[PDB]
Design a protein around this ligand. Structure first.
Ligand SMILES: [Se]
Ligand SMILES: [Se]
Ligand SMILES: [Se]
Ligand SMILES: [Se]
Ligand SMILES: [Se]
Ligand SMILES: [Se]
Ligand SMILES: [Se]
Ligand SMILES: [Se]
Ligand SMILES: [Se]
Ligand SMILES: [Se]
Ligand SMILES: [Se]
Ligand SMILES: [Se]
Lengths: 148, 148, 148, 148, 148, 148
């Protein structure tokens, strides 16, 4: 099925939010097919935020995501891309709804904990960039109580 | 006060979601006046989904709800019918909001965990169908800290 | 496999602890094979607490368990009888350990929330007493990730 | 930064909801700068609900908030006033969304658990009314992982 | 009934553990009769840790408890003094059992989150020291579902 | 500081327990310095369970740990090796105490969810075996509210 890329950013890792976030997605029925902790490299970051390189606040994003460990993961299931964003909330955590990750835990735009792919095309780009193919599960077996 | 009928369907029971769901309603202040586990009978199912019998996907619904145990319950309180639906979410779990039962736990329309009565008239029909009157509490005593 | 009888007593039901308790057992991997809410009858109570009828405080026990709704259930799995007691705690809730049901929620011996069968022989007696055989599941299917 | 006044009303205190509510705000990243339990005085109540004194249901509000203990607190952070209201929900708990405090726990307008300041001007009035300045923290140190 | 004094120390407050801890005691059925946040004064601290003044590490304790906000509370119920200690754990958090507060959250002896009175005589001394009598509830009404 | 190796075995991953387990260790104050999901290779497994190769049930262990994904992690803090085992419980999940991971979630010896290093010497062997040195954090920054 479909796949999305998720990164819990350095402020999320530092605040001890990793297991909480993973648990939310496992409980929803999405299946974990990639997971690692790493300190992102400058040129991985610059590729990651590539669509923003002609703007002034490009360097801020890059600087921040390389300042500490990130946990990177990909999950698989039906409509996982749009669903995962709904679960995260909206860009401003102050305006995100109670029950969403940023709604529950976040307070500042620059420290908004986690992000996910914004479309299926982005996700395929992002997944291939952060993860070598031997790091990803080929055979997925989900609960038969989940799909009809 | 008002009453609604709720059924946690076989996929919810199989996935170990029963106590979680009951706990959500107890925490809200609704009072439990009926509860049993049972494997629904063909002709109970056909009555339950009666308003759909002239459609092609009637047999699917019936087939599924009889394939395993269901836990059936009725709860009592002010506006319990509309409230319980709000707590469950909307038909597609992918589109249900974080914080709602289907929003948190569900992924497929056919495996959407639980359902409740969609009106007060439905509820009275459904309650009398699943539950003999001696199975239901007559005298309800709720928290005085709940109503004014 | 093995089976135990559990009753959440009227103080547990009144305090909204039902779903919490059920959820603890589901999370452990035990499977729910019986469940109902009922107001126990005098002569069911007198049979239930039969081994105590020659003591003075017999009537207290009986009086109390009939004063409100009880939720009765049976669960099935390996060593479920001894395990369930370990999860409940010890007779005095004040002395029960944090993490146990009475340790977390209880404060008085007479209001100790829940109880379970104290042996396999008790359990078979108790189960047959509270539950007609058509109320109990015959075919149990647990997670294959639980047993080897 | 900004500050709001919150009061968990006597129905919230009686129902054992205090720590749950505080925990929600701590998890969001707001910082606790005031906290006490007290039984409000008639003339403190009449000042508190001052903007309603020319209406008939003034006396109800006053009567109720003085009938038991209240826990009063102030929290500090970016957009804390509007954010806290979003977390509480809307006036009718039945219509508040799952994930919000009233959405999860409340059922009646008159027993709606908690309230917060509805603007920054209200908050400054309310804070100075319930709290002497030596009861409030002067120096606040929040997580650097929260703000940019 | 009986009463104990509890203080969540500055490391507990800073780590956002306040509501979690309060919630544990509310869930057990103990009743909150005192609560405030304050920055302890040197001479309050020196009285508090009075039985240790002839030892070398007296000044450390005093220095630390005055370095930030503390939330002080007293709870009331049957055997609340011994019970509360059991819930906290033992002096070394590393050796405290899962389910206990220090067992779940703590790692260092000097940063062990919370403490409670070690006897009824200590509690009466400590309560009168931290709390003026008008700050304490006179009339306590607990759940009738708790005591027999 | 000290480090231990932890593996959540294929039954834990399949049952959706990963985020729950990680969250327990983050809440305790231990810091995550390694994390990946992988399907273990035969000869990695045979090295991992090396001290058991002369026994008959060697092949079972190997067969099982290679049958699905494992999430491997290392955590760092004071007494992390002995502490982590205390948190997991004892070999038989039925006999593990409520509050421990196996006590809460497990039922069978062969399906006991997770394991950790049994000494500091084992941990150094195990860590170097599962993790290349560039996969591990060099610079650790924990909460200053944790250590004295
Ligand atoms: Se992002
Ligand atoms: Se992202
Ligand atoms: Se449904
Ligand atoms: Se339903
Ligand atoms: Se009992
Ligand atoms: Se029992
Ligand atoms: Se309010
Ligand atoms: Se308020
Ligand atoms: Se202490
Ligand atoms: Se203390
Ligand atoms: Se193990
Ligand atoms: Se292990």
């Amino acid at each position: 099925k479909e796949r999305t890329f998720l990164a819990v950013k350095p402020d999320g890792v530092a605040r001890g939010l990793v297991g909480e976030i993973i648990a939310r997605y496992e409980k929803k029925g999405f299946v974990l097919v990639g997971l690692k902790q790493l300190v992102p490299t400058k040129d991985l970051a610059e590729s990651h935020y590539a669509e923003h390189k002609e703007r002034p606040f490009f360097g801020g994003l890059v600087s921040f995501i390389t300042s500490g460990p990130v946990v990177a993961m990909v999950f698989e299931g039906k409509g996982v891309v749009a669903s995962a964003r709904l679960m995260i909330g909206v860009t401003n955590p102050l305006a995100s709804a109670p029950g969403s990750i940023r709604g529950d835990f976040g307070v500042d735009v620059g420290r908004n904990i986690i992000x996910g792919s914004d479309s299926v095309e982005s996700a395929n780009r992002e997944i291939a960039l952060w993860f070598k193919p031997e790091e990803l599960l080929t055979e997925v077996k989900p609960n038969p109580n989940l799909y009809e």
